[PDB]
C-alpha cells in the first residue's frame, strides 16, 4: 500500500515522506534524501531551510534459505537514516520522530510496506563530533532493519 518500493532504501524514503506534517516535532517537515543526492561540500541544510534526512543501506543485506523448497529467501536488510541540522535540539527531536515514525509498520504482513518487519534497531548520537568554535551541522542517526520473504525464480 504505502510504498510498493522495489528496494529497501526507497521503501524507507517513502515511509518517511508518507508521515503527516502533524507527526514531526519541529514546525517544518524535514526533507528526505538519498545519501548520494547531495555532494559533500553542500551536504546538510542551509540556514532558514528545513532539516535534512539522508537514507542509505550501510551494510550487506542477507539472503538466507528459508526452507528446503527454495521457493523463497529470508531476506534481511539494513538502513541508516542520518538527520542533519544546525540545531542540537532539532536533531534530537528528529531522531525521536524517525524512531516513532518507523515504529509504525513494526509487524506488517506486507500490508503497508512490502515487508514483515521494519524496525529501528539502534540510534547514534554524533553531536560531540561538531566543533563548537564554528557554526556547523550536528548529526544524529537511526539504524533500521527490515525483514521479509523474497521470491525466487526456481519454481517459476
Amino acid at each position: 500500500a504505502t510504498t510498493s518500493a522495489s528496494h529497501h532504501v526507497q521503501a524507507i524514503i517513502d515511509l518517511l515522506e508518507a508521515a503527516p506534517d502533524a507527526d514531526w516535532t519541529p514546525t517544518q517537515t524535514p526533507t528526505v534524501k538519498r545519501y548520494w543526492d547531495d555532494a559533500q561540500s553542500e551536504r546538510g541544510p542551509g540556514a532558514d531551510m528545513p532539516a535534512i534526512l539522508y537514507v542509505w543501506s550501510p551494510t550487506t543485506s542477507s539472503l538466507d534459505r528459508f526452507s528446503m523448497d527454495g521457493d523463497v529467501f529470508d531476506q534481511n536488510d539494513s538502513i541508516e537514516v542520518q538527520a542533519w541540522s544546525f540545531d542540537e535540539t532539532e536533531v534530537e527531536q528528529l531522531q525521536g520522530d524517525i524512531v516513532q515514525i518507523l515504529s509504525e509498520y513494526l509487524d506488517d504482513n506486507e500490508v503497508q510496506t512490502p515487508y514483515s518487519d521494519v524496525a529501528p534497531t539502534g540510534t547514534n548520537d554524533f553531536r560531540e563530533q561538531t566543533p563548537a568554535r564554528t557554526t556547523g551541522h550536528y548529526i544524529m542517526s537511526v539504524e533500521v532493519e527490515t525483514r521479509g520473504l523474497s521470491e525466487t525464480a526456481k519454481n517459476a
Binding site: 547531495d38 561540500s41 553542500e42 551536504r43 546538510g44 532558514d48
Partner: protein
Amino acid sequence: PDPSIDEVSKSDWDALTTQEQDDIISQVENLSSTGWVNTSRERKAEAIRSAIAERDTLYSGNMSRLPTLDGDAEYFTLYLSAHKIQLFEGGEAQSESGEGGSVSYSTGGGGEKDLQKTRYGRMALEYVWEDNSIAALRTY
C-alpha cells in the same frame, strides 16, 4: 528571462517581481550540476544583487576607448553570481569524501585574488582583461 541580468542595476533588481527575479535565479542555478539546492533563495538573490552592483562599480568604465568588460555582460554577471554563491557556501571543493567514496578536483593554489580562487571566478576573469592595467591616456 524577460529582463536579462545585464540590463538591470542594483536599484532595478529591487524593483523586480518574484517571477522575473526567480527566472534570473533559475538561470544562475544552471551553472552548477548540484544547483546549490541546500542554499536558500535569499542568499542566491543577495549574491546576484552583489554581482550586479560589483559589475556596475568595479567592472564598468574603460581602458583606452575599449570597455573594461569586453565580453558578454550576461554570462559575466552569471559567472560572478555563481562565484559569489560558491563563496557563500565555502571554498572550492578541492577534496570530497564520505562512506569511503572519495574524489579530488585538481584545483591547485591558483594565486591570491578572489576570482582566481574558484572556477566561476576563473571563467569571469577572461571577460575583464584578466584584471590587467592596459589603460592609456595623453596630454591634449
